[PDB]
Amino acid sequence: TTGYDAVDDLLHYHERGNGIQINGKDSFSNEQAGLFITRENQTWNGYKVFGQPVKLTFSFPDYKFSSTNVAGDTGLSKFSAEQQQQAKLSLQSWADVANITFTEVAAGQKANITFGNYSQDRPGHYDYGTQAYAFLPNTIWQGQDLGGQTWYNVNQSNVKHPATEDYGRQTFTHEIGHALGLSHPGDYNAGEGNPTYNDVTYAEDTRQFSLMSYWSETNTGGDNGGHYAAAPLLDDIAAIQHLYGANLSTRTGDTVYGFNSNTGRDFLSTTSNSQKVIFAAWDAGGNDTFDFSGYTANQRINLNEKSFSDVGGLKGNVSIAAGVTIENAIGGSGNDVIVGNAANNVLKGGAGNDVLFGGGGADELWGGAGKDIFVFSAASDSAPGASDWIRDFQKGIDKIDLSFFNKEANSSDFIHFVDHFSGTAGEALLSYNASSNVTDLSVNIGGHQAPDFLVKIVGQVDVATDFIV
Numbered sequence: 001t002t003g004y005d006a007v008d009d010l011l012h013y014h015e016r017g018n019g020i021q022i023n024g025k026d027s028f029s030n031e032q033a034g035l036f037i038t039r040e041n042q043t044w045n046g047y048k049v050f051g052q053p054v055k056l057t058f059s060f061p062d063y064k065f066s067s068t069n070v071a072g073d074t075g076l077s078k079f080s081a082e083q084q085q086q087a088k089l090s091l092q093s094w095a096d097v098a099n100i101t102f103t104e105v106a107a108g109q110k111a112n113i114t115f116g117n118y119s120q121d122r123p124g125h126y127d128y129g130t131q132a133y134a135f136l137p138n139t140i141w142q143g144q145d146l147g148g149q150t151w152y153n154v155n156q157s158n159v160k161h162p163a164t165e166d167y168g169r170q171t172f173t174h175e176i177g178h179a180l181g182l183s184h185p186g187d188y189n190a191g192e193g194n195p196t197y198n199d200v201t202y203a204e205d206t207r208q209f210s211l212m213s214y215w216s217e218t219n220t221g222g223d224n225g226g227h228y229a230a231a232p233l234l235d236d237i238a239a240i241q242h243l244y245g246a247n248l249s250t251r252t253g254d255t256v257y258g259f260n261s262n263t264g265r266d267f268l269s270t271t272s273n274s275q276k277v278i279f280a281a282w283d284a285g286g287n288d289t290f291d292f293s294g295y296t297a298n299q300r301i302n303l304n305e306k307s308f309s310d311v312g313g314l315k316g317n318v319s320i321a322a323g324v325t326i327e328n329a330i331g332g333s334g335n336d337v338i339v340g341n342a343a344n345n346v347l348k349g350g351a352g353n354d355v356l357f358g359g360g361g362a363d364e365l366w367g368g369a370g371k372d373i374f375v376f377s378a379a380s381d382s383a384p385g386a387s388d389w390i391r392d393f394q395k396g397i398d399k400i401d402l403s404f405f406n407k408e409a410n411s412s413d414f415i416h417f418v419d420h421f422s423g424t425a426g427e428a429l430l431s432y433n434a435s436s437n438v439t440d441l442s443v444n445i446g447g448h449q450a451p452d453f454l455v456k457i458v459g460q461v462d463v464a465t466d467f468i469v
């Protein structure tokens with residue numbers, strides 16, 4: 001496979017929406033999913049009141065063991081220090097993406113969102129079967145609003161120890177989701193009390209796209225390696241931003257995700273190959289980097305909005321929220337595929353045999369060690385006046401892949417190398433400056449005397465060995 005083949009495959013990963021079918025099910029766009037997850041139309045600002053900020057209180061009440069909650073469960077207790085710590089991180093992860101402010105109040109004071117443990121389904125009888133539940137805003141029962149109550153079965157080790165059992169942390173984020181107005185992404189009516197993924201309303205109702213789902217990411221071809229996302233995923237972000245608006249103040253500086261992170265978020269950071277990230281990135285400004293340098297697996301990194309990446313040996317585990325521009329990416333020691341976007345991108349392959357694709361804008365490309373391939377598929381990739389730079393080219397080892405053009409022209413003789421331009425479309429010209437150690441690659445794609453494509457290359461290039469055409 002060419003570099004271009006790999007780029008094309010990553011660009012078309014998890015295509016969705018526009019009426020297509022997947023797994024015999026309707027595919028929804030990110031937007032459609034956000035709307036469907038919020039189909040009850042309930043918010044803390046009112047029924048069908050969307051897009052407005054909200055300020056909410058939360059607490060950890062000191063529930064009495066023999067008391068019975070509204071759902072009939074008993075053996076109640078207050079959240080432990082560990083549970084409180086993890087719940088606050090879950091709250092923060094929702095506040096990061098939408099215009100929600102959370103303020104803690106005292107255990108005995110009325111609060112919008114509450115957290116409690118229960119252990120028994122009836123007095124003296126421990127429940128080992130259930131996990132957790134919560135009430136959406138404006139859930140009126142016997143005259144009282146149950147909205148905001150969240151309840152967890154502390155007999156489950158993950159609920160008791162969410163700091164070391166990542167399904168517990170996910171459960172906290174999920175149930176807070178309900179408390180804010182999110183539903184499961186389907187009702188699963190056809191499953192009649194024993195539902196499976198086969199009963200979804202839309203194909204992207206899986207844990208790849210939403211932590212409001214209970215269906216494995218494997219149903220959509222994801223693979224999270226036995227781990228569970230801590231924080232809102234791509235379609236959860238669409239949902240909650242529909243409800244309370246997008247948080248334009250979040251991470252507006254130059255932000256590094258992954259290794260060497262300055263996010264101050266556990267779920268956006270790692271300090272070792274064994275620590276695997278799973279996240280959907282929301283970022284409201286600045287020059288940002290996906291630093292996945294410390295992973296040894298073969299990775300695929302796509303910097304386009306709404307797109308999925310294969311990071312740290314997982315599949316479809318990293319994504320970028322709608323409306324977000326991430327500028328830079330750093331691969332690991334594996335053989336990576338790294339795809340930029342229309343902005344200026346710094347792309348670094350690291351060790352391994354990498355494929356780099358800057359796309360539009362003026363990109364800076366570093367293959368690193370290994371046999372790397374730099375791919376181009378439009379004159380606008382590297383326009384004169386905004387040229388890409390390949391900073392580390394090694395002749396006989398690295399390659400420039402222009403193969404898209406002859407494939408599109410269906411002619412082996414469209415791109416070809418000449419010693420001087422004649423105005424004929426397809427002509428490519430190399431010019432080497434031994435004094436500056438810079439090679440210019442100029443191509444006349446559009447058919448003018450002046451070329452419309454110019455790549456600047458640090459290093460010599462050997463035309464006999466270094467191209468894929």
Ligand SMILES: CCCCCCCC
Nearest residue numbers: 028032033035036039
């Ligand atoms: C056809 C997509 C529907 C998403 C909006 C929610 C409909 C209840």
Ligand SMILES: CCCCCCCC
Nearest residue numbers: 070071135139141146
């Ligand atoms: C047990 C009745 C509580 C109200 C239920 C409505 C939320 C599903």
Ligand SMILES: CCCCCC
Nearest residue numbers: 071132133134135136
């Ligand atoms: C099983 C109890 C769930 C209550 C919220 C729907």
Ligand SMILES: CCCCCC
Nearest residue numbers: 184188194195196214
């Ligand atoms: C309440 C819906 C849960 C679905 C898990 C099978």
Ligand SMILES: [Ca+2]
Nearest residue numbers: 251255285286
């Ligand atoms: Ca940023």
Ligand SMILES: [Ca+2]
Nearest residue numbers: 285286288325
């Ligand atoms: Ca940015």
Ligand SMILES: [Ca+2]
Nearest residue numbers: 332349351352
């Ligand atoms: Ca690499």
Ligand SMILES: [Ca+2]
Nearest residue numbers: 341343358360
């Ligand atoms: Ca680019």
Ligand SMILES: [Ca+2]
Nearest residue numbers: 350367369370
């Ligand atoms: Ca490399």
Ligand SMILES: [Ca+2]
Nearest residue numbers: 367368369370
């Ligand atoms: Ca290299």
Ligand SMILES: [Ca+2]
Nearest residue numbers: 359360361381
């Ligand atoms: Ca470019």
Ligand SMILES: [Zn+2]
Nearest residue numbers: 174175178184
């Ligand atoms: Zn739920």
